[PDB]
Ligand binder design. Structure first.
Ligand SMILES: CCCCC/C=C\C/C=C\C/C=C\C/C=C\CCCC(=O)O
Ligand SMILES: [Fe+2]
Length: 630
């Protein structure tokens, strides 16, 4: 007598009323199709059955689930199935899939298996037929020329039910309704709404956004701290002199000497150079920054376009108040657009989707890498499709593709390439510090999982599904661009560990850092103008508060930009939380546990650090890092 346990999901529509047939597949034969008829399958419910089988099945290999339409189609989310055999064996079959009535689902037991592990027909056929199905279901498509490839789906509902997301034209509605308690006339001015809705940081930004210290602070610990790099030599396009900035320098060194000492930093928006209300794209600023005596980064010079000239002045903190202020606003404007389109959209969302699609196409559910990654990438596809389904930013993505390299996705390596690695030359870079801690924890975790399933480098290289996975990413996701630096194949356990870390870190930690600071730093519009309604100033001394108000977005229109950021504020599975148990084996369960302990240690490290800070950095606190881009 077999004891069969079927667990239904707890999503709103997890439950089904349809007919459920179940049969077992053993080495010595198959049982017949048993209708699970008693009651129905309700959300959150677990259902157990006693099933007497005719013949000896041998060792159970597979479980066949069939959903027969009963009335209208009622989608059914199956978490897992367990078996208690008459021989006393306890077998678990992970599923975590939406089941429709148009097909039959077949599950392996929870133990993770490489292709070289399966040498009997029953297992080889299932594995091969599953990939065949995957590769019809999940296909590549070019949404826009030059873009990384994404899922072949025009809309969200055209996605396989498996990767569909239960379910921001709404957010708009959310902000509006929830906001009201106000009057309809509050929408005439965003600031009328702002004081009603302020967190600690945004209120700080409203009061201090005009300060050079806060301006420079954001390049390190703001919503988009990935642009700043150490300047080893003054670019010809920026004809700044010691005399121009002497007032800012504090070490009795010339500008040139400060550069050699590694005290000069630069943010260069040449990505915005050549782009076509569109006016924000008239600028492609170069911001020069200085590490003062207190080891704080402050702006010392700003040129709003790339080509130096009489129509393109170098603005300084010694200029008229409103000259300097408007220059900074333009840099904040540029940082905002790069952050939204490049740092956020391209380098976390689209990248994660590439990994997700390649995973589904090339890795069967039983593969250890599927079990590992599925929690971090699964819903990136649906979310990206929703964003897609409802010109300058397109050009930006195209131009940034050249810079989308594998090396730039490896955190420690990326920090280094920007010359920002030194903790002692740049002590107040909290995104770096926390980033490195989290990256190291994921690196340790992935490495352990790899060592458990891959006995040595040779096993990695000879894993055909892993090789196709990597190859799909390189050829399709990254368009086979050689300069991308992505591996065509993975030949060692270390290389594999690093690659998996790239995927998980990008979808979780990196995304959290560049996403969850959006409201803190962008809710006060003047610090993050989504649009600019006037061209950059082309002369010194002519700027007035009128021109600044005319350049900034309309006060009323800003309510909507504010609403968006705040509604999004309102909203989870966090890093290390794996309630969906694809892995069922003791060794990997122990690695997961060690992962969570390493994370908790980082949580304490960060907490203790934040108490000594005037403006705490909590974006990379593992307690707040989601598993995926969700
Ligand atoms: C109900 C599910 C909601 C899912 C939300 C998923 C991700 C969105 C998160 C942040 C990104 C959203 C927008 C950020 C900035 C504004 C874009 C405005 C575009 C426009 O209007 O011109
Ligand atoms: Fe996001």
């Amino acid at each position: 007598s077999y004891t069969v346990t079927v667990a239904t999901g707890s999503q709103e529509h997890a439950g089904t009323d349809d007919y459920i047939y179940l049969s077992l597949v053993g080495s010595a034969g198959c049982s017949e199709k048993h209708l699970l008829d008693k009651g129905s399958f309700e959300r959150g419910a677990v259902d157990s059955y006693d099933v007497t089988v005719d013949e000896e099945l041998g060792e159970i290999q597979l479980v066949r689930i069939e959903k027969r339409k009963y009335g209208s189609n009622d989608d059914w989310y199956l978490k897992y199935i367990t078996l208690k055999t008459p021989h006393g064996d306890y077998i678990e079959f992970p599923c975590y899939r939406w089941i429709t009535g148009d097909v039959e689902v077949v599950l392996r037991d929870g133990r993770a298996k490489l292709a070289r592990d399966d040498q009997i027909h029953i297992l080889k056929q299932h594995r091969r037929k599953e990939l065949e199905t995957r590769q019809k279901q999940y296909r590549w498509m070019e949404w826009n020329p030059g873009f990384p490839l994404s899922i072949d789906a025009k809309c969200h509902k055209d996605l396989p039910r498996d990767i569909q997301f239960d379910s921001f034209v709404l957010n708009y509605s959310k902000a509006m309704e929830n906001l009201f308690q106000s009057s309809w006339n509050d929408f005439a001015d965003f600031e009328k709404i702002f004081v009603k809705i302020s967190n600690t940081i945004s209120e700080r930004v409203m009061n201090h956004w005009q300060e050079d210290l806060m301006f420079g602070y954001q390049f390190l610990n703001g919503a988009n701290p990935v642009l700043i790099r150490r300047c080893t030599e003054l670019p010809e396009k920026l004809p700044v002199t010691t005399e121009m900035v002497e007032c800012s320098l504090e070490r009795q060194l010339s500008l040139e000497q400060e550069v050699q000492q590694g005290n000069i930093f630069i943010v260069d928006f040449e990505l915005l150079d050549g782009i076509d209300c569109t006016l924000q794209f008239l600028a492609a600023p170069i911001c020069l920054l200085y590490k003062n005596l207190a080891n704080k980064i402050v702006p010392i010079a700003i040129q709003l376009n790339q080509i130096p000239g009489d129509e393109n002045p170098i603005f300084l903190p010694s200029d008229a108040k409103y000259d300097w202020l408007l220059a900074k606003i333009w840099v904040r404007s540029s940082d905002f657009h790069v952050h939204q389109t490049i740092t956020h959209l391209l380098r976390t969302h689209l990248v994660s989707e590439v990994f997700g699609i390649a995973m589904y196409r090339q890795l069967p559910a039983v593969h250890p890498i599927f079990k590992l990654l599925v929690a971090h990438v699964r819903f990136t596809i649906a979310i990206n499709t929703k964003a897609r389904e409802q010109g300058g930013h397109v050009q930006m993505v195209q131009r940034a593709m050249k810079d989308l390299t594998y090396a730039s996705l490896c955190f420690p390596e990326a920090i280094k390439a920007r010359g920002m690695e030194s903790k002692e030359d740049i002590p107040y870079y909290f995104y770096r510090d926390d980033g490195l801690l989290v990256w190291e924890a994921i690196r340790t975790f992935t490495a352990e999982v790899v060592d458990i399933y891959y006995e040595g480098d040779q096993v990695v290289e000879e894993d055909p599904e892993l090789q196709d996975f990597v190859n799909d990413v390189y050829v399709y996701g990254m368009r086979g661009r050689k300069s991308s630096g992505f591996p065509k194949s993975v030949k060692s356990r270390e290389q594999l560990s690093e690659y998996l870390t790239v995927v998980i870190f990008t979808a979780s930690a990196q995304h959290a850092a560049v996403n969850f600071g959006q409201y803190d730093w962008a809710s006060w519009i003047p610090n993050a103008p989504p649009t600019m309604r006037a061209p950059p100033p082309t002369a010194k001394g002519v700027v007035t508060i009128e021109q600044i108000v005319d350049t900034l977005p309309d006060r009323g229109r800003s309510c909507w930009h504010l609403g968006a950021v705040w509604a999004l504020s309102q909203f989870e599975l966090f890093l290390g939380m794996y309630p969906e148990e694809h892995f069922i084996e003791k060794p990997v369960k122990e690695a997961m546990a060690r992962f969570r302990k390493n994370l908790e240690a980082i949580v304490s490290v960060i907490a203790e650090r934040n108490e000594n800070l005037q403006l705490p950095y909590y974006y990379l606190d593992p307690d707040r890092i989601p598993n995926s881009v969700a």
